[PDB]
């Protein structure tokens, strides 16, 4: 009853151009079996949404990567939020929700916006820049580590540690094994900065530790919650901002709409998250036999959710392969859905918004003027290099 496919969604050929194979996965049926890795897959919006919103049946505590924590030891101590289920997930989640809350955004927005304006001013003096290294990477690195309260030394470990985390979600292919092989210095730095004395007052890290006396988390749980923000707080924001610039360069008509109304900046970034989905995939593990889209899945089975495919499913979206900055993006799963829905989504949206705002007000044209190079990652989609010429407005 279940179609079996040989598509490897963690192969370089798939990463290079995933959209044909994603249509093949969607159109084969609501539930497929991927013979390459012995996992079930769901690529349509309907099933991805249903799986995300049943955390009891499709749990996260056995890992959201390929590895089943009931069978293999995790490569690091499990995340207290990403790799936990309710009720254990609930109170650590509440702490991170308050640390990255709407009220918190008010305290950082002025500085985040000023740094975005300053970066675009700087890039316009150069003219021809690399929109990844010089913009999508440079800007989040200039605001988020400071907002965490991290010292200056050792920050070069942050993006390599994130690449380790996201490649480690994948199967034991070369991308994963090579990341783990080189991991030791990046893990050592990150684990050390999670300790309370190393986090500057007022920052995200210090605020997590401050919650340890409310009864929501214990003192020994605070370092791992800081670890979550150091794991996830940068790489997808980089990829999302790079995706947005990529979209505005490929769809000049949408840049012109954004220039004419800079208040479209927030939705232009949200549409970029739907369109290029920085997080392509996450796994769940069945806790029981379950019927999903007319398919019977046994207990203890890994289910691969194609978030990027769900965000381009024509059963849900009109013209899904068009970048439309006034699209009603509500309901896309680029940040997930349900109880694990990205707790740092307000930070990512703030950075994306103020950067696209600076571009909307300061830049007249964005033209690719060099070879575009893709970055390969078992879990993330993003660019390695995006040479563009910025023309001032
Ligand atoms: C464009 C940027 C981002 C994207 C596309 C993204 C994507 C996602 C997705 C899809 C999930 C769901 C995980 C699941 O369902 O298993 C998630 C969760 C999470 N994200 Fe993000 N994220 C982004 C930015 C951030 C930022 C900036 C932070 C921290 C400052 C962050 C921290 C987290 C954490 C801690 C979780 C776990 C939440 C939970 O398990 O309850 N992310 N993210
Ligand atoms: C890629 O998204 C995430 C989310 C959470 C974590 C974590 O909690 O460690 C890591 C990566």
Q: Cβ < 6 Å from ligand 2: which residues? A: 79, 81-82, 165-166, 228, 231-232, 279
Domain that holds residue 232: 1-393
Please indicate whether residue 49, judged by its CB atom, sits closer than 6 Å to ligand 1.
no
Query: Could you say which ligand is closest to the alpha carbon of residue 82?
Result: 1
Distance (Å, whole) CA 53 – CA 43:
15
Residue 93 annotated in ligand binding: yes
Pairing outcome for strands 58-59 and 281-286:
antiparallel
Structure tokens of 22?
């994603």
3-state secondary structure of 360: helix
Residue of minimum CA distance from atom 35 in ligand 1: 228
Count of CA atoms in the C-beta half-sphere (13 A) of 254: 22
CA pseudo-torsion sign 138, 140, 146, 152? negative
Chain length of the chain: 393
- The strand pairing partners of 303, in sequence order, are 40, 284
Distance 343 CA to ligand 2 centre (A): 10
How far is the first Cα of the chain from the last one, in angstroms, to the nearest whole number? 58
Q: Hey, which residues does 40 pair with through a beta bridge? A: 33, 303
Q: State how far the alpha carbon of 200 is from the alpha carbons of 141, 146, 195, 204, 318, in Å.
A: 17, 9, 11, 9, 47
> What phi and psi, each to the nearest 5 degrees, are found at residue 111?
-70, -40
Report strand pairing: 363-368 vs 373-376.
unpaired
- Which are the contacts of 140, defined by CB distance < 8 A and separation ≥ 6? 234, 237, 238, 241, 351
Q: Which atom of ligand 1 is nearest to the CA of 307?
A: 10
The reply to whether 4 sits in an annotated binding site is no
| H-assigned helices in 292-344 | 307-310
| Helical axes 158-168 vs 235-250, angle rounded to 10° | 90
CA-based nearest residue to 345, from 283, 276, 275, 273: 273
Do the Cβ atoms of 370 and 132 come closer than 8 Å? Answer: no
CA distance 100 to 105: 7
Question: Does residue 344's CB lie within 6 angstroms of at least one atom of ligand 1?
Answer: yes
How far is the centre of ligand 2, averaged over its atoms, from the C-alpha of 233 (Å)? Answer: 8
Does residue 82 contact residue 61 with C-beta atoms inside 8 Å?
Answer: no
Structurally, the chain folds into a number of domains equal to 1
Structure letter (DSSP) for residue 91: H
Among 345, 344, 343, residue whose Cα is nearest residue 329? 345
In this structure, the number of other CB atoms found within 10 A of the CB of residue 158 comes to 24
Do 141 and 119 contact (CB within 8 A), yes or no?
no
């Amino acid at each position: 009853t279940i179609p079996h496919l040989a598509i490897d969604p963690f192969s370089l050929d798939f990463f290079d151009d995933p959209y044909p194979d994603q249509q093949t996965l969607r159109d084969a049926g609501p539930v497929v079996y991927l013979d390459k890795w012995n996992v079930y897959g769901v690529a349509r919006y309907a099933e991805v949404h249903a799986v995300l919103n049943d955390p009891t049946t499709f749990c996260s505590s056995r890992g959201v990567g390929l590895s089943d924590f009931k069978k293999e030891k995790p490569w690091r101590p499990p995340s207290l939020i990403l790799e936990a289920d309710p009720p254990a997930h609930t109170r650590p989640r509440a702490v991170l929700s308050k640390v990255l809350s709407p009220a918190t955004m008010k305290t950082i927005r002025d500085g985040f916006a000023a740094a975005a304006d300053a970066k675009v001013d700087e890039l316009l003096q150069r003219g021809c820049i690399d929109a990844i290294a010089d913009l999508a990477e440079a800007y989040p690195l200039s605001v988020f580590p400071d907002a965490m309260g991290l010292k200056q030394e050792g920050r070069e470990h942050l993006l390599p540690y994130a690449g380790l985390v996201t490649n480690a979600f994948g199967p034991p292919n070369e991308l994963r094994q090579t990341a783990i092989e080189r991991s030791a210095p990046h893990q050592a730095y990150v684990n050390e900065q999670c300790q309370r004395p190393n986090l500057a007052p007022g920052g995200f890290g210090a605020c997590i530790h401050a919650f340890t006396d409310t009864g929501e988390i214990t003192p020994d749980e605070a370092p791992l919650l800081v670890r979550s923000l150091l794991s996830a707080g940068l790489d997808t924001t980089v990829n999302g901002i790079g995706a947005a610039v990529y979209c505005l360069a490929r769809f000049p008509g949408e840049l012109q709409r954004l220039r004419s109304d800079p208040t479209l900046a927030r939705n232009a970034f949200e549409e970029a998250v739907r369109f290029e989905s920085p997080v392509q995939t996450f796994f769940r593990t069945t806790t029981r036999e379950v019927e999903l889209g007319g398919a019977v899945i046994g207990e203890g089975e890994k289910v691969l959710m194609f978030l990027g495919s769900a965000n381009r499913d024509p059963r849900r979206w009109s013209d899904p392969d068009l970048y439309d900055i006034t699209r009603k993006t509500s309901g896309h799963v680029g940040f997930g859905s349900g109880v694990h829905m990205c707790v740092g989504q307000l930070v990512a949206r703030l950075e994306g918004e103020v950067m696209l705002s600076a571009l909307a007000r300061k830049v007249a044209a964005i033209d690719i003027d060099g070879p575009v190079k893709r970055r390969f990652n078992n879990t993330l989609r993003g660019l390695e290099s995006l040479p563009v010429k910025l023309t001032p407005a």
